[PDB]
Amino acid sequence: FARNEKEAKDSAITFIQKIKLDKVNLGGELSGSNMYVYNISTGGFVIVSGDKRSPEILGYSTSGSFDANGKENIASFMESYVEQIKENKKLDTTYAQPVVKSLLDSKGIHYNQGNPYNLLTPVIEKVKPGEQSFVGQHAATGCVATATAQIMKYHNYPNKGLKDYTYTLSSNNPYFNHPKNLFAAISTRQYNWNNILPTYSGRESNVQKMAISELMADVGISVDMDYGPSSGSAGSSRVQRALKENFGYNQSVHQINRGDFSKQDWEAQIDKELSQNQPVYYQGVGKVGGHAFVIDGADGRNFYHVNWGWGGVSDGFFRLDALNPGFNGYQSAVVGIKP
Amino acid sequence: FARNEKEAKDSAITFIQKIKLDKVNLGGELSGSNMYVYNISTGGFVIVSGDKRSPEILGYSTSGSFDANGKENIASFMESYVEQIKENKKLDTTYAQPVVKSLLDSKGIHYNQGNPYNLLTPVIEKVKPGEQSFVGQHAATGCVATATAQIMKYHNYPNKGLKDYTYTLSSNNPYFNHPKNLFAAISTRQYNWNNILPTYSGRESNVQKMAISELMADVGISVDMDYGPSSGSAGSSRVQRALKENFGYNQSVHQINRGDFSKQDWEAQIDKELSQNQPVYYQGVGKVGGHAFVIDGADGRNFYHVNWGWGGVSDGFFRLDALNPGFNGYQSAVVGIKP
Amino acid sequence: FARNEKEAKDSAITFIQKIKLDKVNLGGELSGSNMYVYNISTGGFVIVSGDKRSPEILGYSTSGSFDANGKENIASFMESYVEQIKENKKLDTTYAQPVVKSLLDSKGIHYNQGNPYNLLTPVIEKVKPGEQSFVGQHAATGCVATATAQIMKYHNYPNKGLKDYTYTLSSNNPYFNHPKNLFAAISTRQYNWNNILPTYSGRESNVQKMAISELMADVGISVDMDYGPSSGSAGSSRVQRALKENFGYNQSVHQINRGDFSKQDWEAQIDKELSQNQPVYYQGVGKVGGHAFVIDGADGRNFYHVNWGWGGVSDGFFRLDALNPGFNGYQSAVVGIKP
Amino acid sequence: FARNEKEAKDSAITFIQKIKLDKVNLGGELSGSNMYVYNISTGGFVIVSGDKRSPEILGYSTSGSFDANGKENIASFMESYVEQIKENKKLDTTYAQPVVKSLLDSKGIHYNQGNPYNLLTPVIEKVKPGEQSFVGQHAATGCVATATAQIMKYHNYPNKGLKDYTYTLSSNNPYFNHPKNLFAAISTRQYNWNNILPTYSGRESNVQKMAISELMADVGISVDMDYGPSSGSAGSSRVQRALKENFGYNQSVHQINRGDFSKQDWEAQIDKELSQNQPVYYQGVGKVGGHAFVIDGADGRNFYHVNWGWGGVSDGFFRLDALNPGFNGYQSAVVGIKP
């Protein structure tokens, strides 16, 4: 029932062909061989299950490459796939939708969490014990901030911020002196979506960077972002409330939880959203917060297209889970996102 | 004698096959159809001549992609290829080396000119009339600084800076108040090449960024970098002198000028260098300075591998010229670069 | 009850004798004759009260000379003496400790706020309306940075900086573009107290100047120095917190406020400190920040020895106040300053 | 015939009285006890001969203090006094004018050779072997530049520079790359003597420092200043030619050499100059150049008042020589300096 190196490698090429493959090295929880990843050298990647009870191809991309190093939201996903491929080993049987092209890619939207996006997030003031100093560096925008902003740029809305926001930074935060209150005067904003480019290379002037870093700063606060070398938020629940109350989005904007649905009904919800050119905020829940990203397409063959808010690396088609017909990662999402 | 779209496009695929191709849009000097560029969508690119008198395949890459937007050193080259393909139109006949794998890629070295590399370059103080403001942004590292630094990291040398440097910023520089004197205390440096990573994603700590941003700051000064939203230097002549006197490299480090050699003898020089695992500083001379880059490999079929000091975009194999057996772009290079 | 010119002058000589005296010219707040200052020509000075209800001799120095021009911390004190000599005019009666030799002088410590100390403070970028341009000049180190640094050199500690610091320049600051974030990598410092001389004449090499200018740059930041042609800080409160957390001094380092003590108990605190060869950070509070200085001795006859962080001019013995047995200038101090 | 410590010390106090004295420590050539220096602690100093054949009091000042450390022109003088007091030991007998108050002091002129005076001298580019680096520092104005500038400010002339100047830096100069040509467009100057203050404290704006730093730069070039951590010039011969041809002074400005005169006639020359409120450029010749200064007064008792172009330290009354009625140090001077 196990699928080993040579075999997986083969499963890859086969999938592609249906060439040189360099295996990717992930560690920590993604250590072991319950799963395999091979970056195709001319471009692209294929992620293979390491056990025939689980499905064969878990995710792929004709182009680009796959990587999780430092990109936690991405690793948090692969972890579930894994502590899931294991839940399939409980069985003894082997493994047994329309098409939407990446909505964000179609508008060339590829944001990140660093400079210049983070040009206006709080500047880290203290060193976390047992960690190198990031003092003087701007916090990261956070992923939910990134996942949210990308979806916002895709609708280029609002033009005018609706309601101001404020919150107190978690007192157990080691990077800042306490108390720390952050405030975004969203209500007084005139978001110029001509200045907020779909992507930055880092050579933009002050007008363009100021635009985006500011969008990112407001979203981040609206979701009570716990800022640091990396930044986390509850996610879904702040995101849905923020989009409507602060940024003026439609009442349809709401949260749905993976656990309230049947796999087909859950998928039907996402497919429905994509059918309307409405990207979907999605996240996996963990301690440190929502490990969010954006689903903005689908290959029709049950794979969804993800944008990890890292500029494009690791972007591609993935399976909502490796489950055999069930750990869901306390998954959830914010749908109905539209003006 | 002309090669038109459909034809070029064909030439491309044929080259590749020997798939989908999206044509790339360049403007200014690269406008017209004396040359064509197609980015292969699964990955890679091919640059085609638009006139049979010039050679067919001018440059290519199995992966990655091609782009010149904003990357002046890269456009400065394509420009010569062009105002060269034209010089072959003077004839009436049609167009008529070992292998080294990218030396820099082999050590995973891919530097840029922005953040965090430019974390310590001068902060732009003034606005150039008729240009948007970059005030408060850090100047760009400049390319020759970048092309130089990649070569330096490849050798991970020196460990100790050898001799201090200083220079006065050109007085006609609009981004700074004058006078402006820049100083690098190179003689007091203990370059830790463990902290100066081969590439940065921007999530590095303070130790790693500090390291690189500082290397880049001393090199940029050692070559009298005229700093701004973009940064230029004389190039070759400062580079060769800087490597030896300031950073302690071998007396063999010296400059050579394209115009002093015969095409085969000029190539022989570069081939020789690569044979020794010694990347080659290379540039094209123009008003604004040396449009430099790094040549660190060869396909054996008369193509050289270039690293544009932009993180990897446009990287690949190129021809030293499109000349038919002659504008050389006042080309030159610094060779013999070793400890 | 008034003491006039001739009388004061006499009071001076008498004090000295117990010779030629050139009266000093102060203006603004120190205008009038509530107080007189005479520089002894062969050396020294004596500051006399202009009204018999207040004490006769307010301050003196066997050598050197007195002057307040441009030296605000010094004028801010003389101002209190005055708007204090007046408060004594409310009465109708006439006016009614071991010895420590200048601690700092004993170690030849005489810092200033200018070049080369300020060699690494922020370079002023803008012109304050209605003021001449200091653009391109380095900001002043600020006094509290100076007062602090002298005390630090007196203890030649730390050897290793403890914790990094960062702050955002006040937004109403006219000499700089905003936002402006300053960072000192204190945590990575290896203070060489052999290079940080006790005083500079300005002919020092790069090693010595670099040393000091850098010490001064880290201290000035640790106290959120609002930089300009002149530089101010909250003082006491940043100074006590900085010494301990950033530079690793003893937990005993703490702030005390003049208003929490009785004149005798307040003096007892300072006397105690000096008894331990522990100079005292002292300041007077005003709008623009703490008008700080250092008290490092006492004549035993109720006079304290001050070092104004101006190289030595105006240094000498002074009275904590001219009060008759009460405006205290919101005075305060940081004591217990030791490794 | 020898005068020892206790005795010299006594001679001092006697001279003064006619108190505490701290002996001054000079080394190198001024080592030994052929001469003694005691700084009076309340202020002032007295320099005593250490051998009764030479005269007793060589120099004094009621105020200030004496020091030679680093101040070569001052040490170069004391050296002659010494290798002169020795020339008197050839004998066996024991030792056997109107008044002008410091001309420069009367106008509060006290220049230095450093910042901000040197704000515009060449920036040192290279390190002299076996010496610490001063790279990036501005050269020193040089003493003859300083002695000359003080005399110029005393007459506040010219208003308009007369003739441009240019020269090539000595090729054996280790602090600069060669060739090095320096140029002052003196002919186009409009010296604003309201901006050229008689002295700077270092807190002046840009207008004041720019003024002086520029006066100092032009004078230094006019005399072919060999620039470095310290700066030397032929002196006298360039100074006399410069003042007339470049700055437009009177034809009376000319050089005179100590060796062309009899001691009384030489003095008569200086006394005459002082009688006309015309300070005198003076110097002692050595290898490295003219060890210059300014004579601008006399005590009538055969002592001349010197200003060492160091801000005031060591200033006072000195004897043209310690000779007993003869090494003259190849002395010389430029007199007749007037508009």
Swiss-Prot record, chains A, B, C, D:
Its EC number is 3.4.22.10. The active site is at 143 (nucleophile), 291 (proton acceptor). Its main location: secreted. The gene is speB. Cysteine protease that acts as a key streptococcal virulence factor by cleaving host proteins involved in immune response. Triggers inflammation by mediating cleavage of host proteins, which can both promote host pathogenesis by triggering sterile inflammation and/or restrict streptococcal infection, depending on host immune statue and infection site. Cleaves host gasdermin-A (GSDMA) in epithelial cells, promoting GSDMA activation and formation of gasdermin pores, triggering pyroptosis. One of its GO terms (biological process) is proteolysis. It comes from the Bacteria. The modification Cysteine methyl disulfide is found at residue 143. This is Streptopain. The C-terminal active site loop is required for the recognition and recruitment of substrates and release of hydrolyzed products. SUPFAM superfamilies: Cysteine proteinases (SSF54001). The mature protease is derived from the precursor sequence by cleavage, either in cis via an autocatalytic mechanism, or in trans by mature SpeB, host trypsin or host subtilisin. Maturation can involve a number of protein cleavage intermediates. Mature SpeB probably plays the most important role in protein maturation in physiological conditions. GO terms for cellular component: extracellular region; host cell cytosol; host extracellular space. It comes from Streptococcus pyogenes. E64 binds at residues 113, 143, 233, 291. Belongs to the peptidase C10 family. Residues 1-96 form a propeptide. The record marks 25-26, 86-87 as: Cleavage. It catalyses: Preferential cleavage with hydrophobic residues at P2, P1 and P1'.
